[PDB]
Coordinates of C-alpha atoms in Angstrom, one line a residue:
Chain A
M1 CA -18.1 -1.8 -12.3
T2 CA -16.2 -2.0 -15.6
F3 CA -12.7 -0.9 -16.5
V4 CA -10.7 -0.7 -19.7
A5 CA -7.1 -1.8 -20.3
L6 CA -4.8 1.2 -20.9
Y7 CA -1.8 -1.0 -21.7
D8 CA -0.9 -4.4 -22.8
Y9 CA 0.2 -6.7 -20.0
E10 CA 1.9 -10.1 -20.3
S11 CA 1.4 -12.4 -17.4
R12 CA 4.5 -13.2 -15.3
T13 CA 3.0 -16.0 -13.1
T14 CA 0.4 -18.6 -13.0
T15 CA -2.1 -16.3 -11.3
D16 CA -1.9 -12.9 -13.1
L17 CA -4.1 -12.2 -16.1
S18 CA -2.6 -11.3 -19.5
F19 CA -4.5 -8.7 -21.5
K20 CA -4.1 -6.3 -24.4
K21 CA -4.8 -2.6 -24.4
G22 CA -8.5 -1.9 -24.9
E23 CA -9.9 -5.0 -23.2
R24 CA -12.9 -4.5 -20.9
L25 CA -12.4 -6.0 -17.4
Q26 CA -14.6 -6.5 -14.4
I27 CA -13.2 -6.5 -10.9
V28 CA -14.0 -9.7 -9.1
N29 CA -14.9 -9.4 -5.4
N30 CA -12.7 -11.8 -3.4
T31 CA -12.3 -12.5 0.3
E32 CA -8.6 -11.7 0.1
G33 CA -9.0 -8.0 -0.8
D34 CA -6.5 -6.0 -2.9
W35 CA -3.0 -7.3 -3.1
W36 CA -0.1 -5.1 -2.0
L37 CA 3.7 -5.5 -2.3
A38 CA 4.9 -5.6 1.2
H39 CA 8.2 -5.9 3.0
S40 CA 8.3 -7.9 6.2
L41 CA 10.2 -6.0 8.9
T42 CA 10.0 -9.2 10.9
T43 CA 11.6 -11.6 8.4
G44 CA 13.3 -9.4 5.8
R45 CA 11.3 -11.1 3.0
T46 CA 9.2 -9.2 0.4
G47 CA 6.3 -9.9 -1.9
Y48 CA 2.6 -9.5 -2.5
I49 CA 0.2 -9.8 0.4
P50 CA -3.6 -9.9 0.7
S51 CA -4.6 -6.6 2.2
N52 CA -7.4 -8.1 4.1
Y53 CA -4.9 -10.1 6.1
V54 CA -3.3 -7.1 7.8
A55 CA -4.2 -4.0 9.7
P56 CA -2.4 -0.8 10.7
Chain B
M1 CA 3.1 3.3 7.1
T2 CA 3.3 0.0 9.0
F3 CA 0.8 -2.9 9.3
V4 CA 0.6 -6.0 11.3
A5 CA -0.4 -9.5 10.2
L6 CA -3.7 -10.6 11.5
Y7 CA -3.4 -14.1 10.2
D8 CA -0.8 -16.6 8.9
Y9 CA -0.5 -16.7 5.2
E10 CA 1.3 -19.4 3.2
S11 CA 2.6 -18.3 -0.2
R12 CA 0.9 -19.9 -3.2
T13 CA 3.2 -18.6 -5.9
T14 CA 6.7 -17.3 -6.6
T15 CA 5.7 -13.7 -6.0
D16 CA 3.5 -13.7 -2.9
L17 CA 5.0 -13.3 0.6
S18 CA 4.5 -15.9 3.3
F19 CA 4.1 -14.5 6.8
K20 CA 2.9 -15.6 10.2
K21 CA 0.3 -13.7 12.4
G22 CA 1.9 -10.8 14.2
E23 CA 4.6 -9.9 11.7
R24 CA 5.1 -6.2 11.0
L25 CA 4.9 -5.3 7.3
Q26 CA 5.6 -2.1 5.3
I27 CA 3.8 -1.5 2.1
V28 CA 6.2 -1.0 -0.8
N29 CA 5.3 1.7 -3.3
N30 CA 5.5 0.2 -6.8
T31 CA 4.7 1.5 -10.3
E32 CA 2.1 -1.3 -10.8
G33 CA -0.3 -0.1 -8.1
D34 CA -2.6 -2.4 -6.1
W35 CA -3.4 -5.8 -7.7
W36 CA -7.1 -6.7 -8.3
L37 CA -8.7 -10.0 -9.4
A38 CA -10.3 -9.2 -12.7
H39 CA -12.4 -11.0 -15.3
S40 CA -11.9 -10.1 -18.9
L41 CA -15.2 -9.5 -20.6
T42 CA -13.2 -9.5 -23.8
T43 CA -11.4 -12.8 -23.6
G44 CA -13.2 -14.7 -20.8
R45 CA -9.9 -15.2 -18.8
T46 CA -9.6 -14.2 -15.2
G47 CA -6.7 -13.4 -12.8
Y48 CA -4.9 -10.6 -11.0
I49 CA -4.2 -7.3 -12.7
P50 CA -2.1 -4.2 -11.9
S51 CA -4.7 -1.5 -11.1
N52 CA -2.5 1.2 -12.6
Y53 CA -2.9 -0.5 -16.0
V54 CA -6.6 0.2 -16.3
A55 CA -9.2 2.9 -15.9
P56 CA -13.0 3.0 -15.6

């Protein structure tokens, strides 16, 4: 259910969450799933993807 | 190792990857881990966090 921040994190974009070590966080269930850093073998581009959009 | 895009996805920020259905993608191993949408019970803010930054 609930996690705790091991480290400070400063947001790098408009969608990530800043937090300081020790905060208590709850994971939100979204349709998109976990996000992974991926490389497209098709296009050569790279960045984060919604795991629920892909399959092995 | 390798996944395939089930759906089109259009990037919403500077760090996500756009792709069209059918592309082949490889997951990149990063230090940050998976990213989760989280809600901070401490601050009330919400957004994506690097899973490796937190523990239960």
